[PDB]
C-alpha cells in the first residue's frame, strides 16, 4: 500500500513448551534460507553449546542449547537460560 513497513527480522523456530527450567522449541522450514543478513554479519545456530535469544518486549532473554533430536519428519531442541540483557 503505502510506505510504512514493520517486519525486518527472521528466526529459526518457536517455543512450544516449558517443563520446569527446560524449554522446548520447534524448528521451521518456512525460512528456506536460514541465512538472514542484517547490519553487521550473518549467523545461524545449529549445534549444541551455542547461544540463542528471545525478545519479551522490554528485555532480551539469553539461553544455551543442550540437545537435539527428531520428532517430513520433525525436529526439536532443548535449552536452558543464563540471564537477560
Amino acid at each position: 500500500m503505502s510506505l510504512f513497513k514493520l517486519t525486518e527480522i527472521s528466526a529459526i523456530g518457536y517455543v512450544v513448551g516449558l517443563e520446569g527450567e527446560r524449554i522446548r522449541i520447534n524448528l521451521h522450514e518456512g525460512l528456506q534460507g536460514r541465512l538472514a543478513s542484517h547490519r553487521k554479519g550473518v549467523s545461524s545456530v545449529t549445534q549444541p553449546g551455542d547461544l540463542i535469544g528471545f525478545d519479551a518486549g522490554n528485555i532480551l532473554v539469553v539461553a544455551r542449547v543442550t540437545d537435539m533430536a527428531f520428532v517430513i519428519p520433525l525436529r526439536q531442541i532443548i535449552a536452558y537460560a543464563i540471564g537477560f540483557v
Binding site: M1, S2, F4
Partner: protein
C-alpha cells in the same frame, strides 16, 4: 516526583507499568497547547500579554463599558480567550439584528484584532505554510515516534489508536503523510469535501495479500469554513492561504462573520455546533469502556466539562489514566495555606486520593513532551541511498 497511590514510585518500575498499560484493548492520548511549543507554538497567556501590549485602547471598554473581562485576571494573565471570542461573537449578532450601528462598528475592530494574534501563533512556519513536504523538517521529529510506537505496539485483530487534541494546527497531519499512514477525521472528497459522522465507524483491509489511526479535534482547525448555510468544507493549506489566512494577517479591518470554525466561536448556529458536539460525544463514549488507558500531556485542567467526565469514569475498575504536570510543587504549597485556583485544587485532590488507578508526574522539565515520548517502549535504514543514486542518474 512520581506519586502512585499517594506513595512515591521509582522510574524503573514506572517504565514497566507503562509497558503493561500499553497492552490493553483500548489506548488513547489527549494533547494540548504545550505539546506544540517545540515546533514554533505559544501558550494562552503569551497570547494575551502580546495583545494587551499592542492594543491597549481596546482594553478599557472590555472592562468599564461591556464587562467581558476582569482586572484581577487581566493583570495576573489568567484569561480564557475562547469564551471571550464566543461572547463578542454574539454581541455583534444582537446589534446587527436590532440595528445599532455604532457598536456593530466597534466589535468588528475588536475581533479583527483577536483573530490576528490567535492566527499568527498557529502557522509554525511563517510564509512556508503554503508549501509542500513540511514534515521532512527536524522540528516534527518527536511527533513521528509517537505515531510509530503506538502502532508497532499493536497485535493483529486489535483496535487502532485514538488521538484527541485541543489545538487547531497541522503539526500532527504534516507528520503522517511522510510516514505513509492514513488518518481518519470525518471528511471525504477532494473537489467538494464534507463532514459525514458515520465515517468514524469504517476501516480498511486487503483483498490480495494498510495502517490507520483516528484523530479528533475538539476546537476546530484553520482549514475548515462555511460558505453555504448547511455545509462545512475543508481545504488545503495552500488553498486557504490565498482565500483568507493572508488578509487576516496583512490587512487591518478585514472581518467576515459566521465563516470561521476556530476556536469554538460560532456555536449558536445549528450547523456549526453539530460539529463540536460529536467530538465531545465520542470522547465521553471512548472514556467509558472496559480495559481502557488514557495518557494526558499539555493540558492545564481549566475546563469544567472535561474534569467531570474524567472523574465519572473512575467508577469503573478497568480505566487507567496517566497525567503530567510540572508545577506540582508550587501548586501544593499554595493549596496547603488556603489558596490556589480551581485548576490546582483538582490536581492536588487527585494526587491526594488513595487510588492505584492514578499516576502523576511532576518534575519541571522532566514532565515535557520529549521526555513523555521517550518513556514509551521500543523493542530490540541502509535502504535509502538508492533513491538519490537514481536521482543522480539524470543523463
Amino acid at each position: 516526583s512520581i506519586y502512585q497511590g499517594g506513595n512515591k514510585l521509582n522510574e524503573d518500575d514506572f517504565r514497566s507499568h507503562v509497558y503493561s498499560l500499553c497492552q490493553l484493548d483500548n489506548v488513547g492520548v489527549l494533547l494540548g497547547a504545550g505539546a506544540s511549543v517545540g515546533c514554533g507554538g505559544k501558550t494562552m497567556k503569551d497570547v494575551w500579554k502580546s495583545f494587551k501590549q499592542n492594543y491597549p485602547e481596546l482594553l478599557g471598554a472590555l472592562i468599564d463599558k461591556y464587562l467581558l473581562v476582569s482586572q484581577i485576571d487581566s493583570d495576573n494573565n489568567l484569561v480564557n480567550v475562547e469564551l471571550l471570542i464566543d461572547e463578542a461573537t454574539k454581541f455583534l449578532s444582537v446589534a446587527k439584528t436590532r440595528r445599532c450601528e455604532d457598536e456593530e462598528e466597534e466589535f468588528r475592530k475588536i475581533l479583527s484584532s483577536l483573530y490576528k494574534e490567535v492566527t499568527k501563533a498557529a502557522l509554525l512556519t511563517g510564509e512556508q505554510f503554503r508549501e509542500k513536504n513540511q514534515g521532512k523538517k527536524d522540528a516534527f521529529k518527536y511527533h513521528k515516534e509517537l505515531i510509530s510506537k503506538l502502532i508497532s505496539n499493536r497485535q493483529p485483530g486489535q483496535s487502532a489508536p485514538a488521538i484527541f487534541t485541543t489545538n487547531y494546527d497541522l503539526a500532527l497531519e504534516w507528520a503522517a503523510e511522510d510516514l505513509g499512514i492514513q488518518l481518519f477525521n470525518g471528511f471525504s472528497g477532494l473537489h467538494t469535501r464534507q463532514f459525514y459522522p458515520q465515517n468514524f465507524d469504517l476501516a480498511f483491509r486487503n483483498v490480495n495479500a494498510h495502517y490507520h489511526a483516528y484523530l479528533y479535534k475538539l476546537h476546530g482547525s484553520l482549514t475548515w469554513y462555511q460558505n453555504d448555510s448547511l455545509t462545512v468544507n475543508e481545504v488545503s493549506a495552500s488553498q486557504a492561504y490565498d482565500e483568507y489566512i493572508n488578509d487576516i494577517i496583512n490587512k487591518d479591518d478585514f472581518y467576515r462573520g459566521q465563516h470561521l470554525i476556530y476556536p469554538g466561536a460560532n456555536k449558536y448556529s445549528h450547523t456549526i455546533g453539530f460539529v463540536y458536539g460529536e467530538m465531545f460525544r465520542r470522547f465521553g463514549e471512548f472514556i467509558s469502556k472496559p480495559q481502557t488507558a488514557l495518557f494526558i500531556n499539555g493540558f492545564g485542567f481549566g475546563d469544567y466539562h472535561i474534569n467531570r467526565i474524567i472523574l465519572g469514569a473512575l467508577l469503573n475498575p478497568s480505566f487507567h489514566v496517566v497525567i503530567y504536570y510540572p508545577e506540582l510543587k508550587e501548586a501544593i504549597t499554595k493549596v496547603s495555606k488556603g489558596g490556589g485556583s480551581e485548576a490546582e485544587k483538582a490536581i492536588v485532590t487527585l494526587k491526594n486520593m488513595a487510588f492505584n488507578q492514578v499516576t502523576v508526574v511532576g518534575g519541571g522539565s522532566k514532565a515535557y513532551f520529549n521526555s513523555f515520548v521517550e518513556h514509551l517502549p521500543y523493542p530490540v535504514n541502509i535502504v535509502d541511498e538508492l533513491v538519490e543514486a537514481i536521482a543522480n542518474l539524470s543523463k
